[PDB]
Assembly symmetry: C2
Homo-oligomer: 380 residues x 2
Amino acid sequence: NNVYITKVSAFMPGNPIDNNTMESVLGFVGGRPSRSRHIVLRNNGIKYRHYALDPETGEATYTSAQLAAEAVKGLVDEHFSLDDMQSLAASSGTSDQIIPGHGVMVHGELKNKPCEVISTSGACAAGMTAMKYAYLSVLSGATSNAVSTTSEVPSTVLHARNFQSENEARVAELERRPEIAFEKDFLRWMLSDGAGAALLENKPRPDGVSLRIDWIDIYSFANEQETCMYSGGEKLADGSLKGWAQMSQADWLAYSVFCIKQDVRYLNERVVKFTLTEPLRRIVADRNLSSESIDWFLPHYSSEYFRMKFSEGLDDINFSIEQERWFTNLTVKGNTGSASIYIMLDELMKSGKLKKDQRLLCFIPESARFTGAFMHLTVV
Amino acid sequence: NNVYITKVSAFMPGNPIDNNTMESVLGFVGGRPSRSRHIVLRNNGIKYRHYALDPETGEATYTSAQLAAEAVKGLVDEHFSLDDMQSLAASSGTSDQIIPGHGVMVHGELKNKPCEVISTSGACAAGMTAMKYAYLSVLSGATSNAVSTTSEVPSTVLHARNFQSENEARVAELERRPEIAFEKDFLRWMLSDGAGAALLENKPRPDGVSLRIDWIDIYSFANEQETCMYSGGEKLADGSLKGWAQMSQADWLAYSVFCIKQDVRYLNERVVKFTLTEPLRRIVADRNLSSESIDWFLPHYSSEYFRMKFSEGLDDINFSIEQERWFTNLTVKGNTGSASIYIMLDELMKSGKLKKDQRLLCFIPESARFTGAFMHLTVV
């Protein structure tokens, strides 16, 4: 009983948007430009990204459910139609609503016949917990195929309108040039929109390359790490997170409780050890891994600032992988959060660089409260 | 390989609250008592329920993460300790925050050692997609045990404070009737708080009874049914759902965008067909089931009004099951959403009424956008 990725699909809304255009798309808070955009862009290295926003009108061009539906429809070919789907697992850190779950909204867009639909939640790793669900479904024999998909439209919550009531509130407290906290403004030049999907099957395709999933290992370090990326709440001085419904309605607006925030200094101190080295050293030992066997390393490292910090982490645990074997399109596609690993896998599989028997290691960290997800693939 | 539920656990916050006491815990909107509470209670037949709310001082007694952690802790005994957990799958229709996912917040409360943590999302069926993830983990051989847990604290969003800006906006608009619509007040007398947890293992336990999971089948009918229960958005005239981030910040408050709403006429028209009869007649045909072979039917039917309507649905597909084989504790535990099936299973496994070889059919509908989840169990 084996599981193979036989088709991957990526969908980026609209056109690539360069560093000089992006602020006009995401808007000015309180009539003024962002103070730190320039150095955020310099540190993260990202040069283009996509937003599900109309360039001329600023209207939304895709809900999160539509974006995911577009990616799933990219899996359809002569070997697979939507109605063949035996199980659909979907996630989005930026779901359009709180209830219903994201997956049934995607099913509503796809309109394929009644089938099993699962939603996973969280952030960067949620696309990988959806993929592991789909993997387990086929591996166990519950189904002979499954589809996982994830989508991200943080443009919905990064646009300047998401901070207007906060700006107006500080103007009623008479401050002259109020600026939103860096913990809020920072993610606005980091996160962008994208969606991916994967078809998993219990036999490889007759022609072309398939990727056998050998395993998917996931570890949470929330038992001792604090929340680090959060929305729908506010992080307290003691490190705990206060949920939005424990705050007053007035405060939701005055503090932008529903925008995405990052405890940047805490991230910087702990992301490498508690998303990479602590889980990977466990997995290396338990599975008897050799870094020399890995032909392709696909890391979602979010920001050029962390590329070599993660590489140092691999060194510290005797699992060095030279930059020549690292594959990523972060700089050109954007940090699409949970979709990043799908947008990487999509390009590598369609590139023609893969060779039979080659081995792939996928690393998907989630700084939200420090999860590391890892997947080992073998080309067949 | 096989999967056994070897322990179930349930946690109700606080003391049972009766029909006369409940509105003082949940509050008046705009100083006036609710006009619909009496008939909603008349129709749902519920007499007790629990809220994670201090009844003297009104403050929260458990977050959703804490409520689930209390349930997971109920699983611990001489045969299982928290650190033996190879996988945790958690869900909540009322997560404390949007990011991170509910599961890693549960882990942060439990503080057990690093392990795999997965979150599922949605409403009533999300407890069962979480359980099916745990079941597939053990069925596939990925792990030898797994824990699923779900928690509900709708009290956080049903309290009167969640409607106070809309009341003010309706007073300010000079509405002849300033009360909030039935579609927003209805669920305040329907939904209540509770959590459950289940331990799944690849061998039964020697002492006492175990429940072998024969299968879990799930169907979504969102391909043709509109959204029906929803929060963090609003239903448009054309039946689509507009997500909260597409609405102005002022409208979030003016219209209570983040409260839980239900389209009651659409619910009443469609919930029996598209959560019970359409999925179950598929399951019955595919697995060649006979209603005569089921010793215990455990249905989450939410309201007395629907008990015989679901029973009628069984008749329509020639799967009649008479009331003496139904097991529920709704009237005395409340409608706890996704937790309901855990709270039914907890009582039944502890009642001593289960005999070896008896067969259980669990039915968990989700009206949110019409999913039916079904689980078949055999006492060993």
